[PDB]
C-alpha cells in the first residue's frame, strides 16, 4: 500500500503531463516493492513516451515475467515495438494480449491501428468495431474508426457519425483531455473553428510537456545580422526532404535564395532515402544538417541555436515525422509555419503562418493561433517547371477529321521529331502541332493498342506512357526528366474518345456525400460525360459506385484507374477536360498537378485553410471564373465547361498559357517574394516589436 500510493500518485502526475515526476515516483514504488508488475509497466509506458524505448522494453518484460498473463503489458509493449519499426514484434504482442484476454478493448484498438498503417483498412475497421463493442465509450477507437471509414468513403450513418465526433471532442475539451480527433483530420469534420484551433493547441501542448523534463533555460536570440555578415539565416525544418510531396513542391527554393542576403540551413528529420530530391536540397542549401542523427531534441535544438537561425520554418505541422519539440524549445526568434501543414498549429511557440489573402482572408484570423503572413499571390508553389518540362508543350494525333486531349505526345525532343515528319499541321491556340492519320500515326496507335513498351520512328524513341517504370524508373518518379518522347491516350485508361472527361485525382477521403451529389448532378446534366477517379484506395471504389447508383447514375459514368507513378499521374491529366475539385479538402499538391497539364479546375472555397487552397491557386493563375461561391454555381460552371465547347477551349487555352505566364509555377519569383516577407518579419522584430499581421 506504500508502493500503491506512489504508483497511483505517479499515474496522476502522468495524466497531468508531469512526466519527470511520474518517472521518479514509479522508480520509488519499485525500490519499495521490486516485484510490482503494474509499476514496471507504467514506468515502461512513460519511458516510452520520453523515447527511451530499450529501457521501456526491459520493464515491460520484467512486468510480464512477474505476471505472465498481464495482457496490458503485452499491449503496450506492442506499441513500443511498433515505435521501433518492429511490426512483426508488435503484432506478436498485440495478438498475444488478445489471446490472453479477448475482451481487452485497448489491444483490439492497437491491433486495428497497425492494420490501418499496413494498408489493411477492412481488417482495421473490423478490429475497431470489436474494440467499440467491448467498450462503447472509447473515443480513440471511435475517431480512428471514423477516419478509416472516411478513407474508404463509407458514409453509413454519416450525419450521426459527424455529430458523434463533435460531441466526443466537446466532452474531451471540457475535461481538458487530449482530443481523439487528430489535428490534421479536423478539417474533414463539421467542428467549430474554436474546436479546430483547440484540438491543435492541445496537441502542441504534448510537445511542451515533453521538453520540460530537459529544463532548458530560454535561448538568447540575435538582435541584428552582424555576425551573419548581413545575412538572414533561415532554417527549413522537414521530415520530407526526399521523395515526398513537400520536396515535389519546394525542392528548388533553397538553391534560389539570394546568398548576398540569406543563408539557408535545411534541417532534415528523416534519413537520406537515396532519391534525387534529397540529393538536390543537400547540394543546393548553403548548409544541410541531418537531425535524424540527433534524436534528443535538447541537443538538436542547441545545434539550431548555435547555427544562429533568425527564422525557423516548420514544414511539418502535425504530420508524420514532425519534431515540434524542436520549435517548443524556441531556438530562434522567429518561428513560422510554411507549406507542409494546411492548418493552424494552435501553439504559442509558432509566430506566423505563411499564407495568403485568398487562402486565409483577414476576417478569419480568429481561426489561427499564428499571425497571418501574406505572400502576395499564393503561398502555394510547385516544382513542376523543373520536374516536368517535357509537359510544357504537346502535340496530338488527329485520329479522325481536332481534339487536344485524346492522343497526346510530349517530349524534350518533340520539335525535332515533328520536323522529321511530312505533313504536320499547326493549330494556333502559342500552338499545337497535329500529326495526321498516316502510317506514322498508325504505328503509334498500334504500339498503344498492343500494349507495347516503345518503338522507334525516324530514329526517335517513342515510349508508351504506361511503361515508364520499365524504361527509366527515375523518370517515372519525377527524379529525372524523361529522355524519350511519351505517348498518352484516353484509350490507355478506357476513357471515351467522344465525351467530356471530368477528373479528380485526390485520395478518396477528401470526398463526402454532398460532394458526390454535386458530381452526380453535373454528370446527369451532361449526358455522355464521365468522372475519372483513382483507386486511392481501391476498396473505396464500390462504396463510391453504390452511392452514385443510388443518386441515379448508371455505373459506366464513373471510371476508376490505378494510382500511377508521379510523372504519369501528372502527364495523364492532359487527357481530362475539366477537374472537379473536392470542396471538403481541396487538391493541394494535386491541384498544382492538374493545372500543370493545362486542365481547368472548378472549385468552391470553404471555411478552412484546406478548402480554400485551390481557389488561391486559381486566383494566382488568373482564372477567377473557375471559383464557385456555392454549389449551384460550382455545378453551373462545370456543366458550362462540359457543354459550351468553345468556352471550354477558351478556358483551357487560358490555363495552358497562364501556367507559364502567371506566377503560379515560377519558383524564382516565389523565392524572391518569400525573401521580402522574411525581411519584413525580421525588421518588425529587430525594431523590438513582436508578431503582428503582415498584409
Amino acid at each position: 500500500t506504500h508502493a500503491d500510493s506512489l504508483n497511483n500518485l505517479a499515474n496522476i502526475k502522468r495524466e497531468q503531463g508531469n512526466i519527470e515526476e511520474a518517472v521518479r515516483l514509479y522508480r520509488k514504488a519499485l525500490e519499495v516493492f521490486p516485484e510490482f508488475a503494474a509499476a514496471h509497466s507504467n514506468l515502461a509506458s512513460v519511458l516510452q513516451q520520453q523515447g527511451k524505448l530499450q529501457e521501456a522494453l526491459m520493464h515491460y518484460k520484467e512486468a510480464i515475467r512477474i505476471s505472465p498473463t498481464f495482457a496490458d503489458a503485452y499491449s503496450n509493449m506492442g506499441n513500443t515495438l511498433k515505435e521501433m519499426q518492429d511490426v512483426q514484434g508488435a503484432l506478436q504482442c498485440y495478438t498475444r494480449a488478445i489471446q490472453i484476454n479477448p475482451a481487452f478493448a485497448d489491444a483490439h484498438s492497437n491491433l486495428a491501428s497497425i492494420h490501418k498503417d499496413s494498408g489493411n483498412i477492412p481488417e482495421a475497421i473490423a478490429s475497431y468495431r470489436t474494440a467499440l463493442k467491448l467498450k462503447p465509450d472509447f473515443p480513440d477507437a471511435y475517431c480512428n474508426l471514423a477516419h478509416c471509414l472516411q478513407i474508404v468513403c463509407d458514409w453509413t450513418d454519416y450525419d450521426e457519425r459527424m455529430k458523434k465526433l463533435v460531441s466526443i471532442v466537446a466532452d474531451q475539451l471540457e475535461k481538458n483531455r487530449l482530443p481523439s480527433v487528430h489535428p490534421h483530420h479536423s478539417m474533414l469534420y463539421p467542428l467549430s473553428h474554436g474546436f479546430r484551433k483547440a484540438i491543435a493547441e492541445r496537441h502542441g501542448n504534448l510537445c511542451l510537456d515533453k521538453i520540460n523534463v530537459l529544463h532548458k533555460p530560454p535561448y538568447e536570440h540575435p538582435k541584428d545580422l552582424k555576425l551573419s555578415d548581413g545575412r538572414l539565416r533561415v532554417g527549413y525544418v522537414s521530415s520530407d526532404f526526399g521523395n515526398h510531396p513537400t520536396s515535389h513542391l519546394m525542392q528548388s527554393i533553397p538553391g534560389m535564395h539570394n546568398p548576398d542576403k540569406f543563408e539557408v540551413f535545411c534541417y532534415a528529420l528523416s534519413p537520406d532515402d537515396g532519391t534525387n530530391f534529397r540529393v538536390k536540397v543537400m547540394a543546393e542549401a548553403n548548409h544541410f544538417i541531418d537531425l535524424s542523427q540527433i534524436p534528443c531534441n535538447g541537443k538538436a535544438a542547441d545545434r539550431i541555436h548555435q547555427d544562429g537561425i533568425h527564422i525557423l520554418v516548420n514544414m511539418n505541422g502535425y504530420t508524420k515525422g514532425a519534431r515540434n519539440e524542436l520549435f517548443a524549445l524556441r531556438p530562434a526568434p522567429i518561428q513560422a509555419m510554411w507549406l507542409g501543414y494546411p492548418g493552424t498549429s494552435g501553439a504559442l511557440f509558432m509566430d506566423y503562418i505563411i499564407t495568403d489573402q485568398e487562402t486565409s482572408p483577414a476576417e478569419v484570423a480568429e481561426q489561427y493561433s499564428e499571425k497571418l503572413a501574406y505572400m502576395p499571390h499564393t503561398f502555394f508553389i510547385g516544382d513542376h517547371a523543373n520536374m516536368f518540362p517535357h509537359l510544357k508543350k504537346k502535340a496530338v494525333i488527329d485520329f479522325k477529321s481536332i481534339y487536344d486531349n485524346r492522343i497526346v505526345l510530349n517530349g524534350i525532343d518533340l520539335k525535332a521529331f515533328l520536323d522529321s515528319l511530312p505533313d504536320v499541321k499547326i493549330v494556333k491556340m502559342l500552338n499545337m502541332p497535329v500529326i495526321p492519320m498516316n502510317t506514322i500515326a498508325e504505328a503509334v496507335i498500334e504500339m498503344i493498342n498492343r500494349g507495347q513498351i516503345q518503338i522507334t520512328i525516324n530514329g526517335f524513341s517513342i515510349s508508351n506512357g504506361l511503361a515508364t517504370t520499365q524504361i527509366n524508373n527515375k523518370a517515372a518518379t519525377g527524379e529525372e526528366v524523361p529522355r524519350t518522347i511519351i505517348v498518352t491516350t484516353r484509350s490507355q485508361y478506357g476513357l471515351p474518345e467522344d465525351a467530356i472527361v471530368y477528373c479528380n485525382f485526390n485520395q478518396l477521403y477528401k470526398i463526402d456525400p454532398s460532394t458526390l451529389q454535386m458530381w452526380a448532378n453535373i454528370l446527369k446534366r451532361v449526358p455522355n460525360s464521365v468522372l475519372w477517379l483513382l483507386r486511392f484506395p481501391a476498396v473505396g471504389e464500390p462504396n463510391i459506385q453504390q452511392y452514385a447508383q443510388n443518386m441515379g447514375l448508371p455505373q459506366n459514368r464513373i471510371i476508376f484507374s490505378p494510382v500511377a507513378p508521379k510523372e504519369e499521374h501528372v502527364r495523364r491529366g492532359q487527357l481530362a477536360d475539366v477537374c472537379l475539385d473536392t470542396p471538403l479538402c481541396n487538391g493541394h499538391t494535386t491541384g498544382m498537378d492538374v493545372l500543370w497539364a493545362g486542365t481547368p479546375m472548378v472549385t468552391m472555397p470553404g471555411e478552412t485553410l484546406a478548402s480554400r487552397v485551390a481557389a488561391s491557386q486559381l486566383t494566382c493563375l488568373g482564372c477567377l471564373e473557375l471559383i464557385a461561391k456555392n454549389r449551384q454555381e460550382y455545378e453551373d460552371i462545370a456543366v458550362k465547361l462540359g457543354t459550351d465547347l468553345e468556352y471550354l477551349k477558351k478556358v483551357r487555352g487560358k490555363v495552358w498559357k497562364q501556367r507559364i505566364s502567371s506566377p503560379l509555377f515560377n519558383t524564382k519569383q516565389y523565392t524572391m517574394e518569400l525573401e521580402r516577407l522574411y525581411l519584413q518579419m525580421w525588421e518588425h522584430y529587430a525594431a523590438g516589436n513582436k508578431p503582428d499581421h503582415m498584409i
Binding site: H182, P245, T319, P342, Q507, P565, K566, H588
Partner: peptide, 7 residues
C-alpha cells in the same frame, strides 16, 4: 509506393 501527406 506513392508518398502522401499523413497525420
Amino acid at each position: 509506393v506513392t508518398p502522401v501527406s499523413t497525420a
